[PDB]
Design a protein around this nucleic acid. Sequence first.
RNA 1: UGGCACCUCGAUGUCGGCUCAUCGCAUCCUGGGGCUGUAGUCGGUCCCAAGGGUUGGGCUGUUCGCCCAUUAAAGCGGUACGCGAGCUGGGUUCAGAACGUCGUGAGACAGUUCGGUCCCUAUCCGUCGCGGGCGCAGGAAAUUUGAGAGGAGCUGUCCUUAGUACGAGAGGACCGGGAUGGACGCACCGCUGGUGUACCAGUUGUUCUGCCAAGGGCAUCGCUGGGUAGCUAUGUGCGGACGGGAUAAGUGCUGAAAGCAUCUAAGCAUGAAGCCCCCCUCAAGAUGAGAUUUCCCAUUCCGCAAGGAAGUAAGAUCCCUGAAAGAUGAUCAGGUUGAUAGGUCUGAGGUGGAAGUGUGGCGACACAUGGAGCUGACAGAUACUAAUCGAUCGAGGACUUAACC
Lengths: 119, 54, 207, 122, 114
Amino acid sequence: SYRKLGRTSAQRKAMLRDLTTDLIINERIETTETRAKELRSVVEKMITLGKRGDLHARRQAAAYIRNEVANEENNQDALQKLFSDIATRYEERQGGYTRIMKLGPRRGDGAPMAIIELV
Amino acid sequence: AVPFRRTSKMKKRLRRTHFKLNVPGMTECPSCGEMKLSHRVCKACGSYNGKDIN
Amino acid sequence: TKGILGRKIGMTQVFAENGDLIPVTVIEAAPNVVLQKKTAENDGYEAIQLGFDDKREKLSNKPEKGHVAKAETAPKRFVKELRGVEMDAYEVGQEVKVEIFSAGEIVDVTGVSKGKGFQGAIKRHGQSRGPMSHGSRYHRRPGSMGPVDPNRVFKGKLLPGRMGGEQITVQNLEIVKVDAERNLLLIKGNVPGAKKSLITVKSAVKS
Amino acid sequence: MIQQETRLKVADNSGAREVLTIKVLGGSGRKTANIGDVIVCTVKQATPGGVVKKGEVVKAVIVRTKSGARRSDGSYISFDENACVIIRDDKSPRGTRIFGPVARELRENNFMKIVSLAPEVI
Amino acid sequence: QKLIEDITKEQLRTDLPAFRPGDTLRVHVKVVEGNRERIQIFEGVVIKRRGGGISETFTVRKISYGVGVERTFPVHTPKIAKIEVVRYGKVRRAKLYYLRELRGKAARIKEIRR
RNA sequence: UGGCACCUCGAUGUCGGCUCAUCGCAUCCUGGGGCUGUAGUCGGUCCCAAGGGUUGGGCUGUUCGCCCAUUAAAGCGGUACGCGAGCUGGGUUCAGAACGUCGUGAGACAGUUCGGUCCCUAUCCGUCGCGGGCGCAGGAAAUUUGAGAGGAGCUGUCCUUAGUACGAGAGGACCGGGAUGGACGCACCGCUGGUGUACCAGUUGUUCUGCCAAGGGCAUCGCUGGGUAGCUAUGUGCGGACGGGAUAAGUGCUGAAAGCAUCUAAGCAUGAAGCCCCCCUCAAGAUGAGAUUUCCCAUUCCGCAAGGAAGUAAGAUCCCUGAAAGAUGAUCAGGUUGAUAGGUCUGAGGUGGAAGUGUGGCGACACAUGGAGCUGACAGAUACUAAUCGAUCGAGGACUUAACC
């Protein structure tokens, strides 16, 4: 199955969207372990849509990828970055564009943390 | 719903036997070993399979 | 008596020669190898051990490999006994296949039901609810706990707890078809257990 | 499924128009009746000109039910109406004609004087 | 579930024509009344097509004498002589449950043909 | 039911419903018998038997009772109304507000409408489930016997036997075979359904993506039509079968005391839904700690002495990937001589005919794609990503004694 992450069905979707949009821009994040484990699947699904490279694809991804500037001095939307750079970067791999690396706990509430990045 | 009698010291001490915590599962790093946690990247020099990430 | 063991695959249907539909369960079987023999003088009773579904070398220790040295086969995953058999016509290392069962025979099947976890009184024991209106404050909870005179609770009161996951036997089940090439059995009905479990298939002993 | 206090209209020319059930015969706690069964029931609404009137307790046989009837070969039948005919001791009916299709899961019992006078026995 | 496919491949039928949920047809079932065997004909509209293997089932609804009668069959039953298709139908869904309360000329589906 | 008055405590809340029940037999049904004023069919009455079973509504009254329709039957009683830190004060229980009959009067009994707002986070013993220690006298991995305990235990019609036995007649069998039901229990999702908030499609208002087309947010998941896995019944499969041993009330065989007789005092039989086995489940903490098969070897230091330390072997655990398991522990499948999860391909299933581009359209729209662009829990391939390196524990057969050897 999947995990509910302690949110309602409508905030879970928004949080997943925000995380998958930030990962594209920053190339590496750090969140909890459960969030990373539930995020890698959606991010991998999005990458493949981009690799296809069509108008239907572009439009499907558009209805999920938040609209934030991904590169200054280039007026590059995050969608344009996804369909331009990453697709050529991983043009030969067959799946598995992510890796998760664990760290120590957190001081405030003892949560376990992890770093998720693109490979 | 209210205790009938007070609790002695023997019963209290007997009940507290399982209220304890264990040692962590930890091992040192090949490069500048600093006795980190197993399957985790250390924060000073326990360089996980390469560089020391943090 | 007679019997073998295998896994369980799923459920389906079969149209009989009278164009009648009957549910069906599938058993995997595969050849079974006898591993040991127990005698009245040496052990106190008569039985034979069975082996099934060998595993790779890394998953077995040294006593296990020593035990199957006599039967001259690879280590096996499942082993269990079967009492009441004719002690002859059986040697250590011999093979036993699905042909021992005929098309129309009757059989008992034993397994382990699926787990259900911590369940309540109404589901675990099939009790009744209280009314849900008319100023009632008693819906799904266990009943009274007995009289006042004994000053205690009897042994045998029924309360919530972990439910399922025990050993069950279902008797008087027919066989439909035997498929020797793939080592298959086609029972008629349902059988305790999840998918990919261990099922014992023994000949019927009346009831 | 038919229980106590279930409106259920007659499908023959006896005089009644609508009939409510009282008890399901057979058994010592039987709760529901499926098809091809007998029930004792009263008459709530009736035609002025006939042989049966209001308030009279009689016996009837179930003919149609919205719940289906399974068959050995695996096929099902189902309707959109609950209907019954009137009978008396011997399974011969009181009326002379039956209106509507009649389920054939009524054949196994001794209900021939019923099947005969009815179209579409299905 | 592959093993089930190899087990039951043989009993599948290779005769029936292809039809859709909105479609009028006519089935040829065999009735063994007593000792005699007579072929009865059912004619009506298709309502449902939920299946998936050796276990598909289609329902056909008709009306006779003012009472709506339904019959459900398995697709691969060996009590079926043959299946026809009389008319086609232009419909917009796969489960036509709205045809139950609706009656009169509010019924009747558009015919596609060619 | 009275009489009488011993523990009245910050009280000796008394009766009907709900949820769960247990015990007696002085037997309502089912099993076995003796007498009849017992031709059969049906009865009456009296013994032996407590394993199982023993119902849905209307009437006002909470009670007692009267009725309607069924069934094999709708049994009497005890457990502080059996059960209010489990529900209903329902009516006991107040009273507080008002509405006839007796009071000079204050008021006292009316019969009726309204009210009580009522509380409790379980310490100990009891119950129901799940773990951690140590023991079983080398250390380990598996397979088991059964002292003992629990569960189950119910009944109706129809067809034969046979319109036969019996009986003027009407009527109508014992014993024995065969089908098919009701209530109850255990498993399961192939079928008929239910739900199915990260599946598909239509649509109202108002905002946002600079505009058109295409989309996102909010409005009970905005509303409506369908639905995969898993969980489920009202759905499907199966069960209470057949027999042994000793008996109860009974029926008896030979047989004396008592030349006869006599179920008995010697002795030997038959005889029940009771009893002990037969069927299903748990079971060696059964300190009486049981049995069989397979591995490891008898190292190194101190201590004359018993003994005490240190590395290990066979074997495990810590740690990590997960679910056929699960509150948490536990159980189970795997750790790079690997398919344990995710991804990527190829499928099964669900919804159903995408967008873009034509073409025909005044338009509102339709036709050419697709029976596929869309697809979360379901299969088969494939090391692309993650299960790295390491660390802790674990024996020298305790101890003799006799017989055997």
